[PDB]
Design a protein around this nucleic acid. Structure first.
Ligand SMILES: CC(C)C[C@H](N)C(=O)NS(=O)(=O)OC[C@H]1O[C@@H](n2cnc3c(N)ncnc32)[C@H](O)[C@@H]1O
Ligand SMILES: CCC[C@H](N)C(=O)N[C@@H]1[C@H](O)[C@@H](CO)O[C@H]1n1cnc2c(N)ncnc21
Ligand SMILES: [Mg+2]
Ligand SMILES: [Zn+2]
Length: 860
RNA sequence: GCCCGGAUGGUGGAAUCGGUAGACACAAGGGAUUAAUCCCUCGGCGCGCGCUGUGCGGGUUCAAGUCCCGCUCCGGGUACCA
């Protein structure tokens, strides 16, 4: 062992030992107890950033911790290879998307190995290979035959000149980010999977997931949005077709003064032939972007349709209106509007001067005041004909039964959750196995023709997909006649919805899953990822597990037992507009900045000379070009230093703002650990520790060693608060530094401490601890060595601290024996001069005493 | 807009079940050997003391960073970024 700590010589040597001896490669061992520690697989963007490093350091800490407890730990790593960013970069760099992705996988694999995460590299998966996507294609065709797949029309962003589908990200400030023209909605047929079939199952099973956080669960409940209500049907005067509308407040039905409808309705098109102003409004709604954010934020405009719907109960003609806020997707694409008891409809009725009818009494039983706002609260009916006097429950059922009896109404469970649309029209994705014959009939691709392989060797113009551009690729022969297979590709969430299952048997050529291997590992014990995936991915993740369960592939009802949603690693984001209106995102390292007195950014230039637009802090990504590469810091300070800093800076779940300051404390700390072991082991071997032959200084030191083990085991195991665990070890290291190591009992005690401390740091800093474990002469490799257990006899306290307050404010602190009564604490508290100062000339009104913790004397 | 989080010294954070606010670190200042290491000071205002202090305004309690009511600002998601 050298005196100086040199990471460059140590770390690469230890990583080679793990690869050659195959330390973290594991099989389905029936003797050992299993632990599946899963981190979410990355998109191969190009470089890693500190967002990636935080995610995988957390998982490797848990995987190494659980390994030391004596369990067969599976920590897999793969690649979510398909995606949009591969296509844009391929055209820009003059390559195909396939080789761009494999080079990024090659680069990032090296970075992960250099960081030294104990992964099972034998179970590696690239989702862009046909070995992977063959089984989801096979699963999709099986899903179609069960009746869980269907085709329908859906709104899509469409740049009209180029004639290509754009994503939400590619639209910016109205116009399209490539060319100068406004983006429009286009109705296009697409494949959907019936996730709403499993709506109640996904919703109700959140109760069983007790080890998931309430942040994620409450978000999913509100996303699914189950809702029991009534679909009311209407007739129109000079129009044949009926208008059906959904509502959760049928009690307020007698106060319905008008009806609102979305722009893409048959009634709106019928009326727009004669009416020129309505025709102008419908063509304006093309510019409405496909996103809930910009749909709600815009001003709630509208125009009168002209047609008059007949209110079934009152018999009154009410005007139909067009509107922006009326979603085509949610409900029936049409609503009853009660402005008297809905804040959205009140604003609409106030603007355009529609009738505002009050039909619900206030809490007191008096008529409502609707001069300022609507009365959203539920109550007793008035101004409702026969339904007057009824409460909310009776009014709901009475108007439901009436409209059911009339035959223009029905009770229905409605979900906010829509069906999962999986058709994309880009190249770099798994092809959808569906075939349109010469007949005209559409049917699944047969089993002999699976997998429908995507051709990797291609050239891309940028506008159209090469598989779509070439008409020869689509050709095939099914049922003894020509046919055209689907050129649309899958959503990238499809590949990430079952990758966790495929890790159990990735080289299994027989089917989608080997059930012996799958049921051994599954369900997942801990699933670590971003809070960014709270809803979207995690809902598909769960949904897809239930489909595989119903297929008879897996036993468990839920895929993951525990979820650890780490906070986002944030960073500043800057950009300047290019020559042809293209957003060039500049990195914070390049950007020269002039700050405010408070800290906020005011101006923003770069090295060249562009006025950069500051878009606040945001998550690190290649999209906004604000990711910070760990390769510089790893080569400077070492992987262990980088890893330790990410865990020490903040607790896992909390959102971190990235900063370079703090890294030097981790490097200095590892030098202090190295120095203390160097000075200890240089003296030589040690004697056997006599437990009951120690001084009070030696007894107290050993108490702190075992108390740190109890804290660090709890902080990692239960709490996942790694910053408090690392801080607890830093305290113990400072006490061990000050402790003298002269005699036999001192060095015997120092052996026990250093063996414990090196084991507790092994999860965080595995490279340095592997080296130090051999120098302390421990049994075998540290990776397989057992986790330290605290001794209950060693941690016994003789006395306890007690704080002495006077009217809440602290005046004294005293040491008192553990087994001590309230009177004994009061007597000791009286002897203190700072306590007795505020007790003179005043009476003790009340005495509060927390056993062995606090005393608060309330004084007049 | 809607849903879910966050705000604590110059800085990242600790206080685990309402009970000592600032552990453990970084940055800064000064000292001590002669880049590296070890010491000292470190929320604010006026001392081996007193008041005050956890984004802003109220409230409950013997006691509030923690619980309650009303806001501000900052982040995540918002169905084609992954
Ligand atoms: C399952 C599948 C849908 C996952 C998908 N392939 C994916 O997300 N790929 S990835 O490359 O963007 O990320 C991989 C992991 O890293 C986390 N992460 C990313 N950015 C940050 C950040 N700024 N801060 C913290 N964590 C981040 C992210 O949540 C994920 O767990
Ligand atoms: C309180 C007065 C009645 C009120 N006016 C009402 O009918 N509300 C509908 C229902 O009560 C609620 C369910 O979430 O959303 C509304 N709703 C139903 N479909 C849609 C849609 N497509 N778009 C926007 N909101 C909708
Ligand atoms: Mg602050
Ligand atoms: Zn365009």
């Amino acid at each position: 062992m050298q005196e100086q700590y040199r990471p460059e010589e140590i770390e690469s040597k230890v990583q080679l030992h793990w690869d050659e001896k195959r330390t973290f490669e594991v099989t389905e061992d029936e003797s050992k107890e299993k632990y599946y520690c899963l981190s979410m697989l990355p998109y191969p963007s190009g470089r890693l950033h500190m967002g990636h490093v935080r995610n995988y350091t957390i998982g490797d800490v848990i995987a190494r911790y659980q390994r030391m407890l004596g369990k067969n730990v599976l920590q897999p790593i793969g690649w979510d290879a398909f995606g949009l960013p591969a296509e844009g970069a391929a055209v820009k760099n003059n390559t195909a998307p396939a080789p761009w992705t494999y080079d990024n996988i090659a680069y990032m694999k090296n970075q992960l190995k250099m960081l030294g995460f104990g992964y099972d590299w034998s179970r590696e998966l690239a989702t862009c290979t046909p070995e992977y996507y063959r089984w989801e294609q096979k699963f999709f065709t099986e899903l179609y035959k069960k009746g869980l797949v269907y085709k329908k029309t859906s709104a899509v962003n469409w740049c009209p000149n180029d004639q290509t589908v754009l994503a939400n990200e590619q639209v910016i400030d109205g116009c399209c980010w490539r060319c100068d023209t406004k983006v429009e909605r286009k109705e296009i047929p697409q494949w959907f999977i019936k996730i709403t079939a499993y709506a109640d199952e996904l919703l109700n099973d959140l109760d069983k997931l007790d080890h998931w956080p309430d942040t994620v669960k409450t978000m999913q409940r509100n996303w699914i949005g189950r809702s029991e209500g009534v679909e009311i049907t209407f007739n129109v005067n000079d129009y044949d077709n009926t208008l059906t509308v959904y509502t959760t407040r049928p009690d307020t039905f007698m106060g319905c003064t008008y009806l609102a409808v979305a722009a893409g309705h048959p009634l709106a098109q019928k009326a727009a032939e004669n009416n020129p102003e309505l025709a102008a409004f419908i063509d304006e709604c093309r510019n409405t972007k496909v996103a809930e954010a910009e749909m709600a934020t815009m001003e709630k405009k509208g125009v009168d349709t002209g047609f008059k719907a007949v209110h079934p109960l009152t018999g009154e003609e009410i005007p139909v209106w067009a509107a922006n806020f009326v979603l085509m997707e949610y409900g029936t694409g049409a609503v009853m509007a009660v402005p008297g008891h809905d804040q959205r409809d009140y604003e609409f009725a106030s603007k355009y001067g529609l009738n505002i009818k009050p039909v619900i009494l206030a809490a007191d039983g008096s008529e409502p005041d609707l001069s300022q706002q609507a009365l959203t609260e539920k109550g007793v009916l008035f101004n409702s004909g026969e339904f007057n006097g009824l409460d909310h429950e009776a009014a709901f059922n009475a108007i439901a039964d009436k409209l059911t009896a009339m035959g223009v109404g029905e009770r229905k469970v409605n979900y906010r959750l829509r069906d999962w649309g999986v058709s994309r029209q880009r190249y770099w994705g798994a092809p959808i196995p569906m075939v349109t014959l010469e007949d005209g009939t559409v049917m699944p691709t047969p089993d002999d023709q699976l997998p429908v392989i995507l051709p990797e060797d291609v050239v891309m113009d940028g506008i159209t997909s090469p598989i779509k551009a070439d008409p020869e690729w689509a050709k095939t022969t099914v049922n003894g006649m020509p046919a055209l297979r689907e050129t649309d590709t899958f959503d990238t969430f499809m590949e990430s919805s079952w990758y966790y299952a495929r890790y159990t048997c990735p080289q299994y050529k027989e089917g989608m899953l080997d059930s012996e291997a799958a049921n051994y590992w599954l369900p997942v014990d801990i699933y670590i990822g971003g809070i960014e995936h709270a809803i979207m991915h995690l809902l598909y993740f769960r949904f897809f597990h239930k489909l595989m369960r119903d297929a008879g592939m897996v036993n468990s009802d839920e895929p993951a037992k525990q979820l650890l949603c780490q906070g986002m690693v944030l960073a500043d984001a800057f950009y300047y507009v290019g020559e042809n209106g293209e957003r060039n995102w500049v990195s914070p390292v390049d950007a020269i900045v002039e700050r405010d007195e408070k800290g906020r950014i005011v101006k923003a230039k770069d090295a060249a000379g562009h006025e950069l637009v500051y878009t606040g802090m945001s998550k690190m990504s290649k999209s906004k070009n604000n990711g910070i590469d760990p390769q510089v810091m790893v080569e400077r300070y070492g992987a262990d230093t980088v890893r330790l800093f990410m865990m020490f800076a903040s607790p896992a779940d909390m959102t971190l703002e990235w900063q370079e300051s703090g890294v030097e404390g981790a490097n200095r700390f590892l030098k202090r650990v190295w120095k203390l072991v160097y000075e200890h082991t240089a003296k030589g071997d040690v004697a056997a520790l006599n437990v009951d032959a120690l001084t009070e200084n030696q007894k107290a030191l050993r108490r702190d060693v075992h108390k740190t083990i109890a804290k660090v085991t709890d902080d990692i195991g239960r709490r996942q608060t790694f910053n408090t665990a690392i801080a607890a070890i830093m305290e113990l290291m400072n006490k061990l530094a000050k402790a003298p190591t002269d005699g036999e009992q001192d060095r015997a005690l120092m052996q026990e401490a250093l063996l414990a401390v090196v084991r507790m740091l092994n999860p965080f800093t595995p490279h340095i601890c592997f080296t130090l474990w051999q120098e302390l002469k421990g049994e075998g490799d540290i990776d397989n060595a057992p986790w330290p257990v605290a001794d209950e006899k060693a941690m016994v306290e003789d006395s306890t601290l007690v704080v002495v307050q006077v009217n809440g404010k602290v005046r004294a602190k005293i040491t008192v024996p553990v087994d001590a009564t309230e009177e004994q604490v009061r007597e000791r508290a009286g002897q203190e001069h700072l306590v007795a100062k505020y007790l003179d000339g005043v009476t003790v009104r009340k005495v509060i005493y927390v056993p062995g913790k606090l005393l608060n004397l309330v004084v007049g």
